[PDB]
């Protein structure tokens with residue numbers, strides 16, 4: 001009854017990831033600890049060269065590890081941003097301190113957009129067994145089957161060390177006072193119910209309730225293409241191919257937005273959601289909010305990612321199905 005923790009790296013506020021070690025001797029890999037999926041996956045040595053992705057990433061080759069026993073099931077993972085596909089294997093992942101014998105997919109068809117823009121290599125999901133493709137007991141549920149942790153919970157800090165995950169606890173030197181929690185909606189997904197999105201100080205989006213996937217594996221707040229299309233229109237931002245945008249001098253006047261989450265209002269001012277890489281006019285800055293249409297059944301939902309976890313430290317509490325936000329630091 002212990003509390004370990006993963007130091008995480010921050011790349012440009014859009015990508016936070018960490019280290020695990022698959023295999024004996026350890027084969028390291030950078031991975032994203034994702035609360036919105038539930039598989040572990042690392043590119044394979046079998047990943048044919050044609051995947052511009054696979055050739056440019058660190059990749060697993062069982063060949064070198066005493067403990068790799070194996071199974072060969074094809075599994076196919078349909079993340080909301082692409083698909084990846086490979087078979088799955090057995091061996092040990094040690095995730096920051098804890099070693100466990102895990103099933104992970106070794107991927108192979110691994111599509112360029114977007115895996116070619118990713119500094120990480122794999123993904124370690126931390127969602128419920130309800131969406132483990134292949135219905136395979138997920139890494140968090142194994143740290144807890146050989147249960148060593150203090151509380152069977154974990155929390156994410158994403159810095160503005162790039163950030164940290166704490167297994168079994170909450171480093172209470174990275175937040176200001178007491179998480180307020182929110183019990184779940186479904187069980188099976190880290191999704192909470194959001195009742196009302198506001199800008200300025202009037203509810204403009206989401207008045208008869210909407211859903212919210214809290215997703216550590218996402219860079220920005222995302223919303224369905226309609227709703228973001230109106231969110232931006234009240235912010236006055238402008239579209240430009242990959243993202244809404246507004247010219248850097250107007251930055252500190254774009255109004256604040258407040259996600260009504262559970263009991264209090266999570267307010268994000270423009271310094272929080274705008275990449276003020278220059279307060280000047282003439283260049284025009286990016287907004288950290290994006291349209292994404294997550295498909296049924298998890299979605300259609302807003303998904304609050306890194307733009308949000310960065311202002312609120314987030315504790316995901318398995319034991320009694322609550323997520324709990326507490327102000328940053």
Ligand SMILES: CCCCNC(=O)[C@H](C)C[C@H](O)[C@@H](N)C[C@@H](C)CNC(=O)c1ccccc1OCCCOC
Nearest residue numbers: 014015016036037078079080081114118216217218219
């Ligand atoms: C079919 C199994 C998955 C079903 N669930 C889902 O698809 C979720 C709703 C979404 C999923 O959790 C995503 N969060 C997955 C995550 C790996 C998304 N990452 C990427 O798409 C990605 C790719 C390239 C570059 C960046 C990306 O995001 C990484 C952001 C990490 O910084 C925290």
